Design a protein around this ligand. Structure first.
Ligand SMILES: *[C@@H]1O[C@H](CO)[C@@H](O[C@@H]2O[C@H](CO)[C@@H](O[C@@H]3O[C@H](CO[C@H]4O[C@H](CO[C@H]5O[C@H](CO)[C@@H](O)[C@H](O)[C@@H]5O[C@H]5O[C@H](CO)[C@@H](O)[C@H](O)[C@@H]5O)[C@@H](O)[C@H](O[C@H]5O[C@H](CO)[C@@H](O)[C@H](O)[C@@H]5O[C@H]5O[C@H](CO)[C@@H](O)[C@H](O)[C@@H]5O)[C@@H]4O)[C@@H](O)[C@H](O[C@H]4O[C@H](CO)[C@@H](O)[C@H](O)[C@@H]4O[C@H]4O[C@H](CO)[C@@H](O)[C@H](O)[C@@H]4O[C@H]4O[C@H](CO)[C@@H](O)[C@H](O)[C@@H]4O)[C@@H]3O)[C@H](O)[C@H]2NC(C)=O)[C@H](O)[C@H]1NC(C)=O
Ligand SMILES: *[C@@H]1O[C@H](CO)[C@@H](O[C@@H]2O[C@H](CO)[C@@H](O[C@@H]3O[C@H](CO[C@H]4O[C@H](CO[C@H]5O[C@H](CO)[C@@H](O)[C@H](O)[C@@H]5O[C@H]5O[C@H](CO)[C@@H](O)[C@H](O)[C@@H]5O)[C@@H](O)[C@H](O[C@H]5O[C@H](CO)[C@@H](O)[C@H](O)[C@@H]5O[C@H]5O[C@H](CO)[C@@H](O)[C@H](O)[C@@H]5O)[C@@H]4O)[C@@H](O)[C@H](O[C@H]4O[C@H](CO)[C@@H](O)[C@H](O)[C@@H]4O[C@H]4O[C@H](CO)[C@@H](O)[C@H](O)[C@@H]4O[C@H]4O[C@H](CO)[C@@H](O)[C@H](O)[C@@H]4O)[C@@H]3O)[C@H](O)[C@H]2NC(C)=O)[C@H](O)[C@H]1NC(C)=O
Ligand SMILES: *[C@@H]1O[C@H](CO)[C@@H](O[C@@H]2O[C@H](CO)[C@@H](O[C@@H]3O[C@H](CO[C@H]4O[C@H](CO[C@H]5O[C@H](CO)[C@@H](O)[C@H](O)[C@@H]5O[C@H]5O[C@H](CO)[C@@H](O)[C@H](O)[C@@H]5O)[C@@H](O)[C@H](O[C@H]5O[C@H](CO)[C@@H](O)[C@H](O)[C@@H]5O[C@H]5O[C@H](CO)[C@@H](O)[C@H](O)[C@@H]5O)[C@@H]4O)[C@@H](O)[C@H](O[C@H]4O[C@H](CO)[C@@H](O)[C@H](O)[C@@H]4O[C@H]4O[C@H](CO)[C@@H](O)[C@H](O)[C@@H]4O[C@H]4O[C@H](CO)[C@@H](O)[C@H](O)[C@@H]4O)[C@@H]3O)[C@H](O)[C@H]2NC(C)=O)[C@H](O)[C@H]1NC(C)=O
Ligand SMILES: CCO/N=C/c1ccc(OCC[C@@H](C)CCN2CCN(c3ccnc(N)c3)C2=O)cc1
Ligand SMILES: CCO/N=C/c1ccc(OCC[C@@H](C)CCN2CCN(c3ccnc(N)c3)C2=O)cc1
Lengths: 48, 245, 290, 97, 245, 290, 49, 245
């Protein structure tokens, strides 16, 4: 959860609405196992 | 290499990239009670992670006509988290504090604060106005808790001592053209090596705007002040049931 | 008996250098140098500025032999100041029967109180002196007994009481023809320092308006009661005053704090006059004049 | 690092680029909630856009700590302080800061 | 040299002078989690005094027609003391337990108890009586807390397992002609090295009178059973706000 | 960086000895000796009694060569027991369209369940075998596809679904003329042991009567779904059953517990019949007879 | 904005313990992610059509 | 020491004093074809100055409602300079690229771009809208040249792949509060060591505003985006007459 701690202060002439882009990855102790098929199936009909 | 910092202790970190510098109160770090000093004969508890966290407490809005605020430590944290649970079970207590107060503003706002510590900050009253009735301050002016309390007469700090020489005690300034935060590391100052956490409040954090806030109309009129504090090297003793006050 | 590496791994910044005299001023010259600037400090750090004389103005070699011995704590506090006055009048309301219990609180007079309120915690030995005389000033052949009542000892309730037998209390029998009785008093507090300021309450419980009288009252500072009677079964035929002067020796003081500027109003609280908050200095009509 | 879409609210085809970034603005108050999202790469939600969350779709069980990076794309002279708090499991959605 | 003992841990001790012997469950003491086993990457808190105390919980009266009781651990101590405050703040948890149950009687009373542990003591129901309706036990039969809960059918222990071979699990007897107390030291048994303290209850303390109480009328008819327990080598991790359930 | 002595000072009792055979019986004689008694034990200690044969009766030298290898866990559990049955009938209600999703819970049959409920935590590898045939027993030339759906993979919803493409799932294509398909399965649980008993709830929150269905359901034990379809777009012309047998190998079991005596009624809970609590053994009319 | 994934670790954000990570990274190689026979073609040879 | 740079190659240099950093695509510099890899048996030409220049190509205006653009390399330079003359005479071709995209703004403008590479950026269509007609993209959407082409559906990059994980491929951001340029050094990626420069376009330069441009009215409303690129270590082979397409 992301909380304002003080505010977002601007001078006059700056846009009073800014946008935060959230990037995400894993660390170097990240491991996975027991491979399976994915949950979305990217096909509805016969692929022509 | 001084403007940018990071204070990680416990599981909580705070980053700042327009800091001033960290001052260590009276030139020494908080430390554990040696066996030359201790008198209690039961083994203290030392939680070491669960209570050495930056607790973000409250948010005071600072407008152009503010007076100043104060927070009595450690009674800001006897209602919060595992510090507030260990300090209510245990009779004795000692800790230091890393006190970090944030106040950001744009590069067009102006104004300066004097965030200062002072130990044993006792509170006087106005003595009935004319000065003849021995009025004692109430319990909420004495120990406001995490809500803080606003100074009535900040020139005399509600104690008959001038704010012009508050700068003796450990302090640093937040002027909004240079910095946006103020770290003050405070050791454990008290005569006796442990004390009660519910009765005795070791020091008070005076945060007073000396040079007032000013900004032309059009800028953001809400300039908050949030204080975060972290009990460092805390240890408790004398376990019994929970008292709240 | 552990295999963890977390438990097995689980200090002052300043050094007191000896400084008998103020420091000398070495010879400096001009400097026309970029990069380094000794004038431009950052006061928002909260450090006092370390800019010296030599890096602001061309100075000469001054061998400073001005001693810094008058400003130590043992030279600033070891002066006997008036901390108590005890009245033993012939007829009146305040102590009409020739005894007086003055509990030892040295914050009753504003010259000794003003100096020792500069520091928060002070640890000191003291030598009290009891200058006693008639209210007109003259000395009379009258015998007095001073005695020191610690916390818990029986307070004497009359002149001809039983507590004046002083089986274990220290007591001083001096007559007024003698020089003033002077006794030295150790550091008696249970804590390691007499704290002049106790932001807190002594007792637990709820803190209502009726028991806000305990605020700021630490039991580590109240060290008893000083009692004085005219030695005799009958009433003495002389009105008396007893002025108590104490000087502090072997002083250690911790944690300075701002010095009082408003008038004192009561003992053991910093209450100040509310409508009469006076400025800490004098004033002038404009800033651009003198 | 790969764009986590915290703002997974808008769905129509003319505003699907709105999902990649979430707004901050000048609040008139004390400690408001900006955004909240689940912190697990398997659950259907924000993490299905990142390649951490879609290579984890091929593996039944994962382990290890994982990082989230927030790039502020405002102007130069706009400042502020945000509190980004990870609440461990069991503890519900927090009600205040 | 076996009948008389003393168990001091924390600030609380208990003396017994008609004990049987201390048994250590599965032959090993409770210990801290090694770094071969731990998977959480935050540093655990270890209070080491304030939670390793003998908590005296409740008092069950034992009359001639009792069935038996059970207490789910550690949910007897998630409402009590600094253990109940650290287990509600922290998500993860591990500890051992020193479990001491007192039941004194005169030298004319008789009767025996089987105070036994068993890990993962899951509770079944009577399945609607005839055995065709899938009824699940309520939350209070599942986790009674410090109040305990009385067994309905102690021959099958409310789980379809006979009490005649409960003696496999760590146990000892309180027969009132020989001893008056029963210490059982239990390590931390669970697959994963830490777990939640609010959901998972590692074991249950079955206290069942097998040979019933008997005394001629004239003796004291109130024979209580009090259990005291002490979390040994406890450590917590994953700090967040207080959950209660 | 400490001066305290409290912080700087801040293990199994039993040794596994090798025992291939039962222990020998050494020669004893009579004994007429006070002081020491090997018969009188104290059962209230909670220890099994360490009284041997030799100190109760005069015994002979018996060299015991009886092996203890049949009673190990790898010889007690490595027998393929029936843990699942899958029906694929031609017309009916239960799976009428030639697919069946059987989620892997091996507590559905009471001979394999009775043995593995002796222990609380078990860690094992298994080799499953899928013996499939018509309900009359005969083998028919029909092709089948078994596939293993882990937790999170898409469950196939029909015979001609897209999830049967098995791009990453393991799948076995065997026809019924072949011998039974036998594949080995590792230890797949996230925890270090399959716990047969989970006294607790998987999810947080309040626990009302509507969600007591989660009690005893641990996610570390439910390891997915086993799906089987008749390979084809049309419907197959043979009714089918698929019996699943698994034997356990590389077994490690922890924490024994009492073995079930009441009848099993449901899967994944120890619910028992309430009015029909039967005694664990047979009975006799009197105790002094046989 | 450098375009680098961040090299911030666990230890410099939170007080951590010594965890000897023995979790293998062999299931995630390309030879274990791709060596599964997937359906890539279907050929119909009907009687009449 | 990172904000200020200078990239000189050939006879053309570009200075930047608010750069981010240079990233080298897939961790390796462009290099010549070794004799372990080459299959053509004629000696290649290597002009080494006349084609390793920063060619400034075009200027896209970026307003508040833009979608994104893409340039197929090396078909942006088969109409320009001595690179466009050597690539039309010679059949084979290999080179790396140093790709530098400038976008300056004031200290009151805001907004971020994702200038990213991706090799073999094939272009799909909308498949007739409903998705049933096999429509192939035209030659100008396929290979727009130095004019660039604007993305229709930038969330799926006109290829059915999401832009949220474009950040896998070599990229860096231009957010106007920190930097104003983005250097991406790309080696030669293709299977076969040389290829044709007129048919095969090795990669595409996606430049997409993710966080949109914003500025209060009064500031400069024209915020251009110019891309400059430099073929590094380029070499050609197989000389014949000029083909143009
Ligand atoms: C019966 O009868 C009775 C008798 O009358 C009645 O009573 C009433 O009541 C009512 C109700 O309550 C009321 O009314 C209200 O009032 C209020 C108050 O006012 C007052 O106060 C103020 C304050 O001030 C402050 O602040 C400032 C700033 O702001 C500053 O400057 C100052 O200095 C101060 O400061 C201080 O304080 C603070 C606090 O915090 C502190 O901190 C510091 O330290 C210091 O100390 C004031 O100011 C005012 O004044 C006035 O007056 C005067 C005269 O002398 C003048 O001069 C001035 O100028 C003013 O005036 C103006 O203003 C007003 C307002 O204020 C108006 O009204 C007028 O008209 C004019 O304009 C006073 O004194 C208020 O606040 C209110 O108001 C509100 O409301 C309305 C309606 O209601 C509206 O309209 C408005 O607008 C407002 O709103 C707002 O607010 C809210 C709340 O807070 C919010 O939420 C919202 O959102 C809004 O906000 C917005 O807006 C704004 C603008 O304004 C902006 O800024 C923002 O940002 C946003 O955006 C009301 O009015 C009354 O008062 C009474 N009365 C009398 C006489 O008083 C009763 O009621 C009856 N009953 C029945 C049943 O009815
Ligand atoms: C309307 O209507 C309705 C109808 O009626 C009504 O209702 C009612 O109510 C009432 C009131 O509540 C009632 O009454 C009551 O009751 C009760 C109960 O009873 C019952 O129960 C019992 C129980 O038992 C148990 O225990 C025993 C021992 O003790 C044993 O043995 C058994 O076994 C059992 O056990 C079980 O349980 C337990 C519990 O805890 C468990 O633990 C176990 O495990 C098991 O399970 C019983 O017993 C009874 O029985 C009876 O009956 C029968 C018939 O069948 C017979 O056989 C018998 O014997 C009996 O009888 C006898 O007893 C009784 C008593 O109990 C009497 O009454 C008679 O008469 C005879 O004698 C039953 O069932 C009760 O408890 C009560 O009582 C009480 O009270 C009275 C008056 O009130 C008196 O008098 C008495 O004494 C008593 O008192 C006591 O108690 C209390 C409380 O608890 C206490 O506190 C006191 O202190 C006392 O104590 C004392 O004394 C004693 C002697 O007794 C001694 O011991 C001691 O120590 C002390 O000292 C009452 O009664 C009723 O019930 C009802 N009903 C019916 C029918 O039921 C209503 O109310 C109306 N309404 C209006 C408004 O009114
Ligand atoms: C027959 O009949 C027919 C029928 O009618 C006819 O037809 C016609 O034609 C005509 C001629 O051409 C026309 O008119 C024209 O128009 C045009 C267009 O408009 C439209 O469009 C637009 C666009 O938009 C865009 O942009 C924006 C910004 O700017 C944004 O925001 C948006 O979003 C968009 O975006 C998009 O696109 C882009 C492109 O680039 C891209 O990039 C992106 O991505 C995206 O996608 C629009 O906006 C518009 O709108 C409108 O409308 C609506 C409704 O709905 C509204 O709402 C809005 O608001 C608008 O309105 C307004 O505006 C307009 C303008 O625009 C006006 O007019 C109105 O009134 C209003 O105000 C549309 O849709 C235009 O452009 C033009 O205009 C021009 O011209 C005029 C005269 O002519 C003038 O006046 C103006 O001013 C202008 O001028 C300008 O321009 C030029 C050229 O460009 C230049 O050169 C100049 O210089 C100028 O500029 C200046 O100014 C400005 C201001 O404005 C500024 O800003 C600057 O800076 C400078 O300074 C015209 O108008 C029409 O249209 C038609 N029709 C119809 C119906 O349409 C025929 O003709 C007949 N015949 C005979 C023979 O006659
Ligand atoms: C024959 C026997 O002759 N005996 C003589 C004799 C003389 C002196 C005497 O004890 C002298 C005690 C003083 C040295 C210190 C007084 N102190 C400590 C701090 N304190 C405070 C602190 C905070 N608030 C208030 N209000 C007051 C304060 O008043 C005992 C006996
Ligand atoms: C072509 C691909 O062929 N694939 C075959 C295939 C076979 C088996 C398979 O996974 C076997 C899982 C078993 C070894 C263990 C089952 N377990 C663990 C404990 N448990 C419990 C625990 C507590 N309560 C209940 N109710 C149940 C339980 O039922 C996966 C795939």
């Amino acid at each position: 959860s992301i909380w304002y701690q003080t505010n977002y202060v601007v001078p006059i002439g700056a846009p009073n609405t800014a946008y935060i882009i959230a990037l995400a990855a894993a660390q170097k102790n990240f491991t996975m196992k027991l491979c399976k098929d994915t949950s979305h199936i990217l096909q509805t009909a016969s692929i022509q | 290499s001084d403007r940018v910092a990071q204070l990680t202790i416990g599981n909580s970190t705070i980053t700042t990239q327009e800091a001033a510098n960290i001052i260590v109160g009276y030139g020494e770090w908080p430390s554990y009670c040696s066996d030359d000093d201790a008198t209690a004969v039961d083994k203290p508890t030392r939680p070491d992670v669960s209570v050495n966290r930056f607790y973000t407490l409250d948010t005071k809005l600072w407008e152009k006509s503010s007076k100043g605020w104060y927070w009595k430590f450690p009674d800001v944290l006897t209602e919060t988290g595992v510090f507030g649970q260990n300090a209510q079970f245990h009779y004795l207590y000692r800790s230091g504090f890393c006190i970090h107060v944030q106040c950001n503003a744009s590069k067009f706002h102006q104004g300066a604060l004097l965030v200062a510590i002072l130990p044993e900050y006792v509170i006087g009253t106005v003595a009935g106005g004319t000065g003849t009735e021995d009025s004692h301050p109430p319990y909420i002016q004495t120990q406001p808790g995490a809500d803080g309390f606003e100074l009535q007469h900040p020139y005399v700090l509600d104690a008959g001592i001038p704010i012009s020489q508050l700068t003796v005690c450990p302090h640093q300034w937040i002027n909004l053209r240079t910095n946006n935060c103020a770290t003050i590391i405070v050791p454990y100052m008290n005569t006796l090596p442990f004390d009660s956490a519910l009765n005795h409040c070791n020091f008070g954090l005076l945060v007073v705007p000396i040079s007032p806030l000013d900004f032309d109309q059009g800028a953001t009129p809400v300039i908050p002040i949030t204080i975060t504090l972290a009990p460092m090297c805390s240890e408790f003793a004398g376990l019994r049931q929970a008292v709240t006050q | 008996g552990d295999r963890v590496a977390d438990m097995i791994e689980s200090r002052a910044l300043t050094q007191a250098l000896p400084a008998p005299t103020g420091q000398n001023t070495q010879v400096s010259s001009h400097r026309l140098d970029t990069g380094e600037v000794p004038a431009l400090q950052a006061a928002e750090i909260g450090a006092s500025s370390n800019t010296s004389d030599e890096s602001m103005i061309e100075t000469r070699c001054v061998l400073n032999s001005h001693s810094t011995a008058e400003t130590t704590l043992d030279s600033f506090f070891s002066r006997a100041g008036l901390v108590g006055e005890i009245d033993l009048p012939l007829e009146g309301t305040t102590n009409p029967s020739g005894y007086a219990n003055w509990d030892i609180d040295i914050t009753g007079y504003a010259q000794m109180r003003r100096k020792v309120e500069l520091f928060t915690y002070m640890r000191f030995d003291a030598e009290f002196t009891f200058v006693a005389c008639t209210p007109t000033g003259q000395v009379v052949p009258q015998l007095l007994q001073y005695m020191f009542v610690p916390p818990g000892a029986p307070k004497p309730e009359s002149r001809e009481s039983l507590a004046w037998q002083t089986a274990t209390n220290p007591s001083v029998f001096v007559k007024l023809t003698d020089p003033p009785a002077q006794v030295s008093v150790p550091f008696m507090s249970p804590a390691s320092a007499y704290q002049w300021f106790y932001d807190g309450y002594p007792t637990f419980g709820e803190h209502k308006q009726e028991k806000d009288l305990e605020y700021g009252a630490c039991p580590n500072n109240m060290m008893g009661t000083f009692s004085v009677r005219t030695v005799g079964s009958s009433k003495s035929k002389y009105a008396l005053v007893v002025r108590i002067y104490m000087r502090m020796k072997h002083v250690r003081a911790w944690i300075p704090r701002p010095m009082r500027n408003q008038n004192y109003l009561f003992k053991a609280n910093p209450n100040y006059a509310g409508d009469s908050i006076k400025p800490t200095g004098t004033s002038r009509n404009a800033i651009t004049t003198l | 690092e790969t764009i986590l879409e915290v703002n997974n609210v808008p769905t129509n085809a003319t505003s699907l680029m709105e999902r990649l970034r979430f707004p901050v603005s000048a609040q008139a108050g004390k400690g408001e909630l900006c955004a909240v999202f689940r912190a697990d790469p398997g659950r259907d939600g924000p993490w299905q856009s990142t390649m951490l969350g879609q290579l984890c779709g091929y593996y039944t069980q994962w382990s290890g700590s994982l990082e989230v990076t927030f790039m502020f794309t405002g102007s130069f002279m706009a400042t502020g302080k945000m509190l980004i708090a990870y609440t461990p499991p069991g503890g519900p959605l927090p009600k205040d800061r």
